[PDB]
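Exercise 7. Predict the joint structure of the components listed below.
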Amino acid sequence: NQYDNDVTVWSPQGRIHQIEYAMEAVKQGSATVGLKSKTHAVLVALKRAQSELAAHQKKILHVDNHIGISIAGLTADARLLCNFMRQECLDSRFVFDRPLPVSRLVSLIGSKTQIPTQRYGRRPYGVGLLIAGYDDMGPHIFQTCPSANYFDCRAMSIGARSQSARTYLERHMSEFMECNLNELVKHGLRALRETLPAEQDLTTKNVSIGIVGKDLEFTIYDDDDVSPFLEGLEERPQ
Amino acid sequence: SIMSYNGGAVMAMKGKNCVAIAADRRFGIQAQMVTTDFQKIFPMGDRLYIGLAGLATDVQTVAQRLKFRLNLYELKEGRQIKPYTLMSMVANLLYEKRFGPYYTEPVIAGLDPKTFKPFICSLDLIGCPMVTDDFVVSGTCAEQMYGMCESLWEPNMDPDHLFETISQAMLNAVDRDAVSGMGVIVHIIEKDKITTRTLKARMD
Amino acid sequence: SRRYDSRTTIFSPEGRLYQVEYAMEAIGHAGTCLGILANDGVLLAAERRNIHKLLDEVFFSEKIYKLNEDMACSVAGITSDANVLTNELRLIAQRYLLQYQEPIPCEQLVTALCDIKQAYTQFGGKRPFGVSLLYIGWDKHYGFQLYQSDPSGNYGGWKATCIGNNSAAAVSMLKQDYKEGEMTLKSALALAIKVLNKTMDVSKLSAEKVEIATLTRENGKTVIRVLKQKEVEQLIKKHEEEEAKAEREK
Amino acid sequence: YDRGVNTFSPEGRLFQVEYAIEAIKLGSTAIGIQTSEGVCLAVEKRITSPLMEPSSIEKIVEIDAHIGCAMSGLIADAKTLIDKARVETQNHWFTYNETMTVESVTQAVSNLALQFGEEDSRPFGVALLFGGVDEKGPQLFHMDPSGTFVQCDARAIGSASEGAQSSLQEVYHKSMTLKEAIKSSLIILKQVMEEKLNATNIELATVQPGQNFHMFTKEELEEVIKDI
Amino acid sequence: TGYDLSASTFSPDGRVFQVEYAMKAVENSSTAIGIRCKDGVVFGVEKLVLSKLYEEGSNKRLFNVDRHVGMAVAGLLADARSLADIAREEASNFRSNFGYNIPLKHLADRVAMYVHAYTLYSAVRPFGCSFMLGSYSVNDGAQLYMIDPSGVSYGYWGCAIGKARQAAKTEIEKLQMKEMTCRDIVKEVAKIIYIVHDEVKDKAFELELSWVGELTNGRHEIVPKDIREEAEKYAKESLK
Amino acid sequence: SYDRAITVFSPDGHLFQVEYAQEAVKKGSTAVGVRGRDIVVLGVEKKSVAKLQDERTVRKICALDDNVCMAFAGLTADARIVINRARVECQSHRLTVEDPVTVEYITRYIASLKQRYTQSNGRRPFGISALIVGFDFDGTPRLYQTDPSGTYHAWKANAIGRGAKSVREFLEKNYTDEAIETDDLTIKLVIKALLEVVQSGGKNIELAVMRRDQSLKILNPEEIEKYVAEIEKEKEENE
Amino acid sequence: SSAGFDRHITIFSPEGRLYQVEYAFKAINQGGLTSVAVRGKDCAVIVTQKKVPDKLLDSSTVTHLFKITENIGCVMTGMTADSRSQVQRARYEAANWKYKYGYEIPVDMLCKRIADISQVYTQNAEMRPLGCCMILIGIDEEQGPQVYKCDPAGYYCGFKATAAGVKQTESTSFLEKKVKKKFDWTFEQTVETAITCLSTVLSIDFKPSEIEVGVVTVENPKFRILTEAEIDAHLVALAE
Amino acid sequence: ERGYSFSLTTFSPSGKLVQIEYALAAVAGGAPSVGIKAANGVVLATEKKQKSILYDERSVHKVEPITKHIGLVYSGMGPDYRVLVHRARKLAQQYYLVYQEPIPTAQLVQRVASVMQEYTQSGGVRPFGVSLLICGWNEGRPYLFQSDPSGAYFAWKATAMGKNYVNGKTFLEKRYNEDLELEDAIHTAILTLKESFEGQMTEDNIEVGICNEAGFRRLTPTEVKDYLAAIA
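Solution:
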């Protein structure tokens, strides 16, 4: 147990436990699912209430006109990476006068989160960022982790009880490349409804859906515009 | 010039077993005097004086900075300061302001603390030491002071004739100067005592 | 790191200080210094440590440090730590003279040191000064003065004080024999040699084991007289003569 | 060890942040309620001595002429938060000629609380309630030492805040009025404190759209007590 | 054991266990091998698919440091990304100060001294990475290097980094690598990967082959094995 | 268990090293202070001269500016830094803003300087508590107090030091809602309050008053002995 | 005794000892290596073996003989990573002498400056004290050849016959019996005792391709590494 | 780096400094030495034996000059000595750059002891393990001082540091007097070093430096062989 104190201290098994504990902070937050077609990349999150009459905490937040991210984990590390995220997006607009390629922006994050996972004096960032974007070669779905690894993927679900969402995505990933937004969005939010206890339903007040498109700027819909998306659904087989 | 802003004249002269130093008394801006009691000779220990001439700011400034370093020297060591040691101390203080220099030219006169050996030297405004055996002069009316000392100085002189020689050298040269005058004070020191006299000069 | 650090800054659960009380006890296991006022003077006395017969003593002063021109100080505690404070304190008294061209008036010199000695008990993890030391001097405003520095930073203006656990019985003696009002130099020197007769347990009071320095305001000069060992001898024999009167009553 | 200054749990949060929530529990209670007519607010002073001056204890301060406040927990750390909350709403008027909205105040306030450590020390021990009338009508917000910022419609924080929030969710509905919500709040106050409810125990704070003045009632509050 | 906390402390017998602990963290990573022929260097990495949602070419371990220099990392992948950016930055200053390409013998010295500096202070930890360096030139030929987490760096003809470090170099040394061409090497690298535990107790995998030498005119790029698929056609015939 | 740091919290949310600084205040001599109609007054106890020292260097009552006073407790070293710092701020305020300094402004400086002095590690907090009394802000008498946590606060009658709980309970049954006019009556309230001293020797009380227009008026041990006589004159009505 | 943290950091123990530096004295001994230097004549000879356990491991990138300047060569024992970083300071500060002072650095002056860097790591804490050892040779004009040796503690000396690595106590005992009749050291008497000491302490009687020989001589003062052919010439010359 | 900045020395509850008392134990287990102040000079001597017959003697010196009239020896551990030697060289030139005059031996010990003070109080460093003996003939009278790793200093007539110093302390007290010559002082300085030496004493086992008024001078082995040539 004496090796379980700092980021610097290695173990006699070769595993640093402080990085292994920051993965556990990702499982505290709620579930969120991102996926993409050939032309459209949609990530869908799940709000959580604090009390019975407070507003629900937002998950999806706009970054750039072609980049939007989701969140899972500490809200302190959330806005701290967002302010680093927005600063790098407008520097390429100010210098190069082009939007950033999405694949090389995430490489700046892995260089950003590597220093506080090696030097003493700062904990690792407990955060579960899902990233959707548009470079010149189509849509992308990215995830990160507090071990500073970033994974390109075509579908991903992270957060609380998100293993049941992964099983739905693996047996329907062959259908995702062809279908358009009227069902591609509700292919995604059929995966959230297995990350729920079996007695309540995904309502209009606890879900956010963000869409960025090839000809569409990144747009966040919540609590009023979810009703054209929740129409035309079946119930759970209970 | 900047040296000619307030005037001044400091002369030192070596005798047989004694040494003398003299200066003027006039304080003033370029053509307007202010007072006739401006001190330009400062005691730095017994039997060892220093004279300053030039810009009246740096006269009062360096004499306080040198007093700052002398008292710290005479407490780390129980002895007093040697006259060669003070010359190296002043030359260090002027050279630190190599490009921001003080506008003064110091004249150091005094005896040895152990023996009776006199010592005279003068420095430039950036700290070039220059020891002699007969006299050193500094101030605005320098060229008049060389004309009097080259003709009146004798090698081995009692304190009687040494006082009379430095008196006639200061009176006849400063009266030729315009921005210096209004009284001359003379210090003559020796092994046994210190004598200070003021002279009857022209007050115009 | 964290497990290598010393405390030096942490209160007790009852509120007392952990390291400051320790440094105030090491001074009691050290030399003895005292002072006494007079109507026209002030004096200091000291105890010689390491009186081995292969030393030189060429400094003319070991416990006494003539600090500005009209002030001196004894010292007690860690001798290696003591040289830092004296070179600073002469340097505080000398930058005052550069600033006003008037000597330092013997109180705000002490508070200038007592703020420096205090600051190591506060911020910064550092070792405090284990040195208490005396003060003598003269000013325009009050005259002859004594002061009592502490590792905590406290100072007090005393009429007759000394060191504690080494010579704490002297303070009980000074309350019995120091009479107020008349305390002149010949009366104060004979009072001082009586005290060190008891506290220093060496019999007959060998003159190589003591050290006495005085200060008299004399014709506008304020001399500081470190009196030589030749006149320590007859000062002892004057007190040695007082035993002959002390046996007449019995 | 046992989770010292900056080290993750094997399961969840930092316990220094978790113990910062517990420091609010030894504070003083306070209730804020949002109504479409305006934002009412209340607090308990907890005055100990009669020689102790009553009007020196502040809990409602004035951040700006349309933004009120409420605090609980540590008073010593709350004076740091109120200081820059007054400054950076004033910097916004200097460079934009307009009033900063109520939500974007606490954006700047929640940046500074998430800065404990040695980077360029300890977390804070104070929760806050912010009332105000921006361009979207009246608003009410709440923050914690964890930086978790959220909008509430009616919120009670401080000591005995758990028993306050249970009965408070029954008496609230969407169509309240401001004259109704003030007496609806102080009934909850005298049921959670122990002293007799008078004009020296509590104080009120109301902000309106047309009445951006008068964020502090003073001895008109004596009329409200005798009416209930 | 006990004093094994800091990297700036010695054992009572004279070794640092924090360097020893980080070496066998590289042991748990999958096998990446390297080999050079007489006119080139051929890399090869066994890389396993995480579950299914990997998108066929993500998070690769065949980097590209310079115009003629690339890496074959294994171990903690995030720690190798920060270490690869040092070698990208180090080769740029040699260009800007001397005007020509970095020699591989000088490049491996600059990197290994940088890895050495994280094994001395108590504030930082040693790296958890080991990697390969291969290059080709006309005045120097082909070279192949090897850097451990401690910082020891010298040259090989062939190597392996991962679980099967010993189990791969047993059958590397039975090749006549001194005279083969690096087109015949590519079909021989793929069978070394597929012999030792490609998907036996694991789930799945995908082969990556990097490539530098005389046929690329000094360039470093991935193989056109996608073209004609000949590595898997020749290695899967070794089932019996 | 866990304290040994000013940045760590307890499992029930406490700062014990801050709370231990208030325990050092209770080792000090008691000092009381009330405000009145025009004349404010504060007194201290426990002089205890030791037969061989000068008593003008043990002073516990100082003035920051011309119309504000100071009384403290705790340990003598940390008070000297706070006093010397507060003299600078109440003088540099006058240079930047040409008004005199209010009594409320100088207490926020002392509290905020003690505030940031608690936050950073390796900075031992001040173990003193202070009483700031001044009828300076446009003819209005006020008195505040401080705390080692850094919380400035206003009372109308105050007691600190070793035995403050008895005196503060005494003044609640004694400070009349009838305002103590004829200000020698208000001074006699303090001498009656300081009569419950740790030993009550009578000649160990150093009362200092201020008539809100003049400077500080340190009382002599002949005028204060007259007020001790009339306190025994009112005590003759018990029989 | 273990008082405070004397077994962990560089502080004094009771009885004036300190353990974190004398743990570094047997930090050399994990190399499995032994180096011998002999001064007898107007020449100076280094001899040190190589240990090649792998046929995939190269031959030219094994050499412990390091060329500091043209007239100064050295050999390194101990662990490899601390050894090459120590040489980077020795190559650096030998050139600062030429720049600041305008002539070639003496071998005596350089061994001072290297040991002064190892001083501060013992003096200051949280700084690991470089568990390796350095032996120098060179020609000084009007002084003949010299052999110096540096310690991790910062201690240096100059002496005629040197052993290092693992087997000092057996080799230095052999050389005192050798250097007590000061016979004619004639540049082959020096090389033969440099071989026959190591060939009897290790007791191998080895093949011509496992050692290196560094040499410097009053005639050709350049540092010079011997060739495998002429190493074999001296090896068969002692076959009597 | 981090910037840790904490000292490794605090007070005991008894009031003693623990690590400084441990550093004097490493001083007492060093090579022995002796220094004698005569009526016209100061004599320094030391014990320089190699662990082998291989070690050259013309490489490392024990008696070491500071100025041309100031020398300095030690008893403790080897490599810590060369730090403060090079520190005292640069310090002694700074007096000469200001005052144009060679430094007196009293003023040098005022500043070298302040350097040894600074490693005892500052953060994370350890105190020295070397005591010194500092000599010199300035202003007629010669001087002989001794500085310890605590930071204090003294002024001896004759003393001995190193191993068996309590035996040499009694032997110098029973042999020295008020005055001798310098040539008589070296004779009683080897006879106190012959007390604790090994079975053989040659020109290369001891090493002697002197201080005449003509300046500082360390002796070549020609004189030291001729001095121990049957004159004890």
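Discussion. Chain A has six helices and ten strands.
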